[PDB]
């Protein structure tokens, strides 16, 4: 009866909802954002990731192509053709030196941008997973964390090319993971309608969150470092807290049927903007679930989002292969 | 672009944007096919006939200056629900069945039904194969096999008069029983958006490539005839 005891403790620790606490704050009336460019890849786009300099960005398409743009002057910098024609995720290093890619395959490729020659070449070919790679992120210029389709996560070591830690426990395949701001722990959501928290130091699961209707499509981490949000295919966006161990207020509307594909916060944590299948990227108040702003302009499914480090711009990409910098 | 460096930057960007035109020209004139099979089905023999924990394998074949990519998904997890979304632009799905086991058919029928009824995979034509005929004939004419026990309705069957065989009435009756069993699922639904093209292939038939070619052509033709309401 451990689950019953945990549920009873959670019920006892619950005192009030976020609506009652946040009713005493004046809401944000309306926010209007418009395009300021169209960064225009042959096939559909499956991922993107902002650089740390808040100027560059990298996009990956099903053609088997990675393109590194220049968000201010719209120019292109690098165009890398992959060895595999099916890629699902790409990651940009925090030091602006490497990029990583991985799709429906058992490989994570590492490309070294800065070389003595004016070309980019693959420097590490991380193999050892069994299922398709569904997420990959960097910790520093030496460690990379991947979440795969064989219901596992793996923390690697690029220098030696061998695994260092393996995270197991999920019954279904994991879709996306997000890293904590201090790069100590992280979170990862799977198709078993559960998101688990992992600690790098000992490589063991430390916390679980469950109670969501369907499989998890995307996950994002609160800027403070002690909360996170998830979006899934059940037309609901959920918020969870680490210390409280509770499922807090849910951002949902009665006129939405399709499923979320990507969720990202804002720099100040005041707005939660999430994409959808209905060609749109809706915006919600983080404390009242008030729909304040609809960002239309896409003619197909939205597959990626992202807010830059300093928060000036947010870039969205869809299945018609058109990246749009909103503002 | 007023500065000196920014002009070289924009010309480098343009030169980057003029190598994508060639890739688009190559990528438009190429037909993509998706291969599915089973464990005992001779998909490996077929893919060798046209021409390490990996997940996907590549095959290319060209007929009459027409190029076909043939994506064969390899060693993956048993559930195909989530990575099937990537394959909603392919021209056709080649599906492979071994009709020589007499028991490993019900699972094949449920797999075929799942492929047919997948809503991502709707409006995608399914080319279908049958492999290891000769084993089927050998097990049919050697006795000691209770085909009627496996399929109770097999006994009361009559070859459609449409048969065009080219030796044993019972063997052909069982063959067309299997063919019609596969065709029932496809004829149950569909609403005239995607079609199935059953065939009868030996272990290694050199004609096979041409076969696919013909089927592919037909599919595209029908698509055009519906885009114009001219069908």
């Amino acid at each position, epitope marked *: 009866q451990l689950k019953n005891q945990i549920r009873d403790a959670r019920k006892a620790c619950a005192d009030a909802t976020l609506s009652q606490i946040t009713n005493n704050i004046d809401p944000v009336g309306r926010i209007q954002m418009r395009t300021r460019r169209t960064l225009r890849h042959l096939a559909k786009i499956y991922a993107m990731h902002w650089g740390t300099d808040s*100027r*560059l960005l990298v996009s990956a398409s099903q053609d088997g192509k990675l393109i590194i743009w*220049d968000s201010y002057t719209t*120019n292109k*910098v690098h165009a890398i053709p992959l060895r595999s024609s099916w890629v699902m995720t790409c990651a940009y290093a925090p030091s*602006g030196n490497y990029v990583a890619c991985g799709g429906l395959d058992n490989i994570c490729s590492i490309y070294n941008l800065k070389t*003595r*020659e*004016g*070309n980019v070449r693959v420097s590490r070919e991380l193999a050892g997973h069994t299922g398709y790679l569904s997420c990959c992120r960097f910790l520093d210029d030496n460690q990379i964390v991947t979440s795969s389709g064989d219901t596992t996560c793996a923390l690697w070591d690029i220098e030696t090319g061998q695994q260092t830690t393996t995270f197991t426990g999920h019954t279904g395949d994991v879709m996306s993971l997000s890293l904590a701001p201090d790069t100590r722990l992280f979170v990862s959501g799977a198709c078993d309608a559960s998101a688990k928290l992992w600690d790098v130091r000992e490589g063991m699961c430390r916390q679980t969150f469950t109670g969501h209707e369907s499989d998890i499509n995307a996950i994002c981490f609160f800027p403070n470092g002690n909360a996170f949000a998830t979006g899934s295919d059940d037309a609901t966006c959920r918020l969870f807290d680490l210390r409280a161990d509770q499922e807090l207020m849910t951002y949902s509307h009665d006129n939405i049927i399709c499923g979320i594909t990507s969720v990202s916060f804002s720099k100040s944590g005041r707005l939660l903007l999430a994409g959808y299948d209905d060609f749109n990227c809706n915006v919600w108040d983080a404390l009242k679930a008030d729909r304040a702003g609809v960002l239309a302009g896409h003619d197909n499914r939205v597959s990626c989002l992202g807010v830059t480090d300093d928060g000036m711009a947010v870039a969205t990409g869809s299945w018609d292969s058109f990246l749009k910098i909103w503002n | 672009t*007023l*500065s*000196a*460096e*920014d*002009k*070289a*930057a924009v*010309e*480098r960007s343009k*030169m980057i944007e003029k190598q994508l035109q060639k890739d688009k020209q190559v990528y438009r004139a190429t037909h993509r096919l998706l291969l599915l099979g089973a464990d005992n089905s001779g998909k490996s023999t077929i893919v060798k006939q046209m021409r390490k924990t990996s997940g996907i394998f590549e095959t290319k074949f060209q007929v009459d200056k027409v190029n076909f990519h043939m994506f064969d998904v390899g060693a993956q997890r048993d559930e195909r629900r989530k990575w099937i979304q990537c394959f909603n632009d392919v021209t056709a799905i080649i599906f492979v069945v071994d009709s020589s086991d007499y028991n490993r058919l019900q699972e094949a029928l449920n797999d075929f039904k799942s492929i047919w009824n997948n809503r991502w995979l709707r409006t995608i034509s399914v080319i279908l194969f049958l492999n290891k005929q000769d084993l089927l004939a050998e097990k049919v004419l050697a006795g000691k096999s209770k085909i009627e026990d496996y399929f109770p309705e097999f006994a009361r069957y009559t070859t459609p008069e449409d048969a065009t065989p080219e030796e044993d009435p019972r063997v052909t009756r069982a063959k067309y029983f299997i063919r019609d069993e596969f065709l029932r699922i496809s004829t149950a639904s569909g609403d005239g958006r995607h079609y199935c093209y059953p065939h009868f292939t030996c272990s290694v038939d050199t004609e096979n490539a041409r076969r696919i070619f013909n089927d592919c052509r037909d599919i595209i033709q029908r698509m055009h005839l519906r885009q114009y309401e001219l069908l």
Partner: single-chain antibody
């Protein structure tokens, strides 16, 4: 990575000569190329220019029809043809690579070089010509510009080269603040828009040489005079 240059020698006045710069060790087809001339008793001077795909070519104001530039990608060779040469074109020639994109490091690797014996542009000047130094003191070098080099975007296009007595020039600072790749982390540079300075904290026996000042804000690339250290 290395570049090998061939040609030169003794040429009678009015003749024609071909100089070849052979590149081996990088992607020659993704790099813009220049040619830099240094007189036996004077400083550096920019000669020509060619882009990656030969889409754009500039030329010096001193000579415009006497020099022809060409490139050969499959053999990776850069050709310079001179005809009707005068007595002034009797200096050292250097082959220079440069790649331009956001965050790049132009004018980094220089060739060995081959000998040869027979208006509205911004001018840049150096205050001193030779100063005495000691192994361990702090050194400051000043450069003066005739116009504000700071641009609308924010870049301050100025470069320091600091060649050595008997070797090819190197690169130290690009765009007035960014350090080079291999240089030790003790050089520094600063400026305000018209006057710039470069500071060396420590000092070793390898720092002896001539320090150069270059601008890259318009089509002409004008240099300084030089500052020898003893």
């Amino acid at each position: 990575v290395q570049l090998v240059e061939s040609g030169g020698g003794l040429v009678q006045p009015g003749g024609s000569r071909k100089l070849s710069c052979s590149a081996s060790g990088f992607a020659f087809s993704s790099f813009g190329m220049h040619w830099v001339r240094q007189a036996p008793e004077k400083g550096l001077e920019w000669v020509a220019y060619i882009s990656s795909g030969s889409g754009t070519i500039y030329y010096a104001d001193t000579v415009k029809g006497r020099f022809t530039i060409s490139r050969d990608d499959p053999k990776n060779t850069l050709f310079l043809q001179m005809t009707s040469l005068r007595s002034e074109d009797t200096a050292m020639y250097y082959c220079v690579r440069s790649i331009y994109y956001y965050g790049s490091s132009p004018f980094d690797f220089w060739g060995q070089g081959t000998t040869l014996t027979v208006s509205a542009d911004i001018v840049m000047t150096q205050a001193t010509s030779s100063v005495p130094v000691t192994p361990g003191e702090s050194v400051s070098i000043s450069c003066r510009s005739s116009k504000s080099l700071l641009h609308s975007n924010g870049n301050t296009y100025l470069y320091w080269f600091l060649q050595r007595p008997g070797q090819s020039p190197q690169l130290l600072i690009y765009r007035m603040s960014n350090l080079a790749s291999g240089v030790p982390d003790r050089f520094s540079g600063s400026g305000s828009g018209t006057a710039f300075t470069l500071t060396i904290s420590r000092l070793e026996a390898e720092d002896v040489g001539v320090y150069y000042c270059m601008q890259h804000l318009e089509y002409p690339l004008t240099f300084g005079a030089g500052t020898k250290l003893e």
